[PDB]
Design a protein around this nucleic acid. Sequence first.
DNA 1: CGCCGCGTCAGACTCGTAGGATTATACGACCTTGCTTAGGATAATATTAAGAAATTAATATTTCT
Length: 106
Amino acid sequence: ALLRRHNNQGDNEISVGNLRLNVTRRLVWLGETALDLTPKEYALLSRLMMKAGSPVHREILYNDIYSGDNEPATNTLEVHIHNLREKIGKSRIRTVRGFGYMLANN
DNA sequence: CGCCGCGTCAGACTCGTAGGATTATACGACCTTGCTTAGGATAATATTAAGAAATTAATATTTCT
């Protein structure tokens, strides 16, 4: 409840185009079908959709999926975004060099 | 021999300490210089595939216990 009221502005459903995300139920809906999303990809997608339209920093994402203790040594955020874009479509997740990524609303 | 009159130069020491020197001022015209636009060609350079394989972290047996 807390997380939802603060970040998702109180709403239980994020509606961006054909993407619909129930953050409380952990459910992602491409159009009307359901998607099998790994934990990490779910976290990334959650964050991008909550801050709809506005690019999120790379470091914000890196913290958001990676617990302080287990921090890897190589390219992971990029691969996770790649698979998120493969399961969702290259159009949704636009790349903003230097300052992370952005989910397009328009 | 015994002045004698010219410059001449540092004169003890610790604390803080405001205002300070006018006059009267030509136009072009090259020529150069010292800094700014600008316009693409590359060159880094940040990211994206990709896959593949390698753990590796979970899922689901099944065998003990």
